[PDB]
Amino acid sequence: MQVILLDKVANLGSLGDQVNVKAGYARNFLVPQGKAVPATKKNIEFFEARRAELEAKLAEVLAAANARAEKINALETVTIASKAGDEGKLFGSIGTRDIADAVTAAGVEVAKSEVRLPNGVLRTTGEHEVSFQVHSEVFAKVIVNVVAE
Amino acid sequence: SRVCQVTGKRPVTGNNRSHALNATKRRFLPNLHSHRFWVESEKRFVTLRVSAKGMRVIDKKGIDTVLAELRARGEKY
RNA sequence: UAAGGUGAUAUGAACCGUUAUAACCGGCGAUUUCCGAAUGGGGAAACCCAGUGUGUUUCGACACACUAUCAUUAACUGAAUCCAUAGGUUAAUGAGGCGAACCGGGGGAACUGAAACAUCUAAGUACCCCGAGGAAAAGAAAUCAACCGAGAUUCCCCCAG
RNA sequence: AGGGUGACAGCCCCGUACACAAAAAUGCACAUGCUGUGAGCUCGAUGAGUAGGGCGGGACACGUGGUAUCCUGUCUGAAUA
RNA sequence: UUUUGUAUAAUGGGUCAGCGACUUAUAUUCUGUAGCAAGGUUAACCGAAUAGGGGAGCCGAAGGGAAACCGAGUCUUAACUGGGCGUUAAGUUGCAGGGUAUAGACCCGAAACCCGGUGAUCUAGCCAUGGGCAGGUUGAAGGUUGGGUAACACUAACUGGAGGACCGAACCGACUAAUGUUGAAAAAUUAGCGGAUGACUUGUGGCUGGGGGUGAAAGGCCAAUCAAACCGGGAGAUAGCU
RNA sequence: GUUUAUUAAAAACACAGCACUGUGCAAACACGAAAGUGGACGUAUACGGUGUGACGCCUGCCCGGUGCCGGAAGGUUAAUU
RNA sequence: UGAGCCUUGAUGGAAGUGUGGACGCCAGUCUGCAUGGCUUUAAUGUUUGAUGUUCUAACGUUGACCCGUAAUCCGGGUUGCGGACAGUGUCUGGUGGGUAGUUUGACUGGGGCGGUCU
RNA sequence: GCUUGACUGCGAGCGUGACGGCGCGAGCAGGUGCGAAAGCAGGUCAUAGUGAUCCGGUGGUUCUGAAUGGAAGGGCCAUC
Ligand SMILES: [Mg+2]
Ligand SMILES: [Mg+2]
Ligand SMILES: [Mg+2]
Ligand SMILES: [Mg+2]
Ligand SMILES: [Mg+2]
Ligand SMILES: [Mg+2]
Ligand SMILES: [Mg+2]
Ligand SMILES: [Mg+2]
Ligand SMILES: [Mg+2]
Ligand SMILES: [Mg+2]
Ligand SMILES: [Mg+2]
Ligand SMILES: [Mg+2]
Ligand SMILES: [Mg+2]
Ligand SMILES: [Mg+2]
Ligand SMILES: [Mg+2]
Ligand SMILES: [Mg+2]
Ligand SMILES: [Mg+2]
Ligand SMILES: [Mg+2]
Ligand SMILES: [Mg+2]
Ligand SMILES: [Mg+2]
Ligand SMILES: [Mg+2]
Ligand SMILES: [Mg+2]
Ligand SMILES: [Mg+2]
Ligand SMILES: [Mg+2]
Asked: Which nucleotides of D are covered by protein (CB under 7 A)?
């Protein structure tokens, strides 16, 4: 009695691993109570077609927008800015929708504040490339041109 | 009728055989048990009179198939 | 088919016939009480007692038909549980019981032989049980052979006491 | 061939050899129809709680023997031209 | 007939007539006989059917050795002066007979073992439901009332109606004697005898089945029978016995 | 009171009473390969087995033997591995 | 809890003001505990058997209830109790006149006893 | 005193038994001991001191070996 799993399952469980358990546990508890299945071989591909049409399928289907920053590898036009101040230095901060004002007409239009650098956000020159939240992995690159008026 | 509903296993005859080799008619009869099985294809408990081995057979072929026999052989279940 | 007939003990009576409906013989039908698988219920076989349909210049009641169980199928119903299954009624099909041997299978003795007796024998015999056919069973090699070859099963003669 | 007829019958009777016969119901063959039914070619697929094994029995002429082969009550259990 | 021996007072037969016991099959050997002869003969089958075909095969012409093997020799042994078994005699197939083997095997006969059935209409026990016990005795508990006690105790009449109680018919039994014993009767008759309101007795129906029942227990009873019923079968059990 | 129906009616069996011993209830025990059932519509003041056999006065010694009961050490010890 | 492997501490960013355990060659120094400009050792993660607690979900229920159902059966369902026990199948040791089949010699001045049997 | 003839293979020819078997035996071959030698020795003065067959054990031995080569098992000799 080997059988393969569904839900978790105490001292062996793993949503689909390859266990070998006493037949009692199974024909008395696991199946007929949906948690496992006879490894009828027919099945050890029916549930290995998954381990391939998934753990290397949809784990590849992730990669179709590399860094997402595809043809945005030469900065973005600088419509306005992000602000300045202190007659020389800096003084003003990013309102909860104010690092787009600049890159305000490129990709797609949003308005949210997924803050990444928990500092006072350094006040100096201007043009800085950190990252920003573009996904649960990759990154991007753009610059910041101030406004002289 | 001590008879395994899945394998057809009924009692057989044989001798005993002492040291002196004395035959004495006897029976071997199967390890029956009659067990409640869950189907899920039927949302019910069907309870077959089965010998172990009869059991080891469902454990493999699978209930929905074993009951597929019986039905196709006429048996009640 | 016919010039003679109405079986026998067994006459007699009253009749039927002789050129084709006398009788006799063969094919096919009709009728076929009651008991009996007996099947509407019962029961001490040939008896008792029903239910539902019908049916009458006298539509009381009394006669005629249907009504057993089980299996497959179908329709309609339909619990605990709301679905669903179980269950329930109806219908259409089929089975039932009998009977020689041979036949396949399920069980399976002992007397006796061994000059006693237990392994062994009698013997898978007697017998009980189930199933079937004109035969049954078996049967197209995971069989033999022996370095050549043979080519399913069945039966006979050898091989060989 | 045989049987009978007042004793033993080829030629008295019934038969016998031989040659014939069915309106009907059936048996078996064929030749047809009806309902089925599947045919031939190519490409596939090749019978797992099975084979095998432990234990206890039973079959094999073979009495467990050095004992192959077969069946299985119990417990186990492969390979895949 | 059996016996050392039977007139035997040891077995058997009343008598007659009819029946009544060494067979049959297959193998196997010998003898007789016939055919063919180092050869004889076919089986199944085919069939032109007692022919003919069929030579599969069997027996014989070669033995010795456990065997490999050798071979008129071979084995024994290292080898035999030698020793054992062989080479020097015809066979084979029918047919008839004498034996033997396997079969009931010359015929009749057990007590029994085993298998499947039929029997609780006799009887044992139990179950349901029904019936019976003339007549006569004894007179438990309890009650009432007196007498008695301080009160109980106690006591007397009466009342009451206990009991596997007493006597005794029916009814159930069966202790003794005689009769009977080719009976009136396959268990009785007659005179006596025990129980007789009880663990009584009895009708109808029911249940218990054979290594089983039932049994106040005798191995009793289970259809005129029981240390394992009856009927049919195994079955012509076996019979070193008569 | 019972008994050998048919050679034994007794001192035999039974008996009320006594004891031992088993049984917690799906009881022990018994019929039955089982299901089912008696025990019992009972429950230890009950049910079974065994022996003794009213009652009176009593019922002593022996556990080596056999049987039975209890025993968590060791020795020996089956299938199994 | 008996044994194996994987591991992080034992055999094969300095010195001073401060601690439990110890075969410590017989009087060490250690194994660590604070600080301060492949082979002799302990715990886990674990793999493998033994023992014990408990669980529930096989299985038991000769408790109660519901329905099939006007039913002391059965079945399904609910619930309560018990529960990997009990029970049963196969194998296996013991016991086992309850039952079964048998055996239990001959000679002999009848038989038995005694005695004898080459 | 010296020694292993209590030897191995055989055996004319007798005895004695219904049989199974038992006994006696000169002599032959090989090899051995004692004796200078002739010669003696195949247990013990002789006659009891024993157990057929089956089954199995051990050693030897290609004899056998179920397609073939092996092996198992069998045979043969010794012995339990
Ligand atoms: Mg009728
Ligand atoms: Mg009827
Ligand atoms: Mg005998
Ligand atoms: Mg056929
Ligand atoms: Mg195939
Ligand atoms: Mg005399
Ligand atoms: Mg005289
Ligand atoms: Mg005389
Ligand atoms: Mg009666
Ligand atoms: Mg009285
Ligand atoms: Mg009286
Ligand atoms: Mg009288
Ligand atoms: Mg009688
Ligand atoms: Mg008889
Ligand atoms: Mg016979
Ligand atoms: Mg006879
Ligand atoms: Mg008498
Ligand atoms: Mg008397
Ligand atoms: Mg008592
Ligand atoms: Mg007494
Ligand atoms: Mg006394
Ligand atoms: Mg006995
Ligand atoms: Mg016998
Ligand atoms: Mg004698």
From this structure: 48-49, 56-58, 64, 72-77
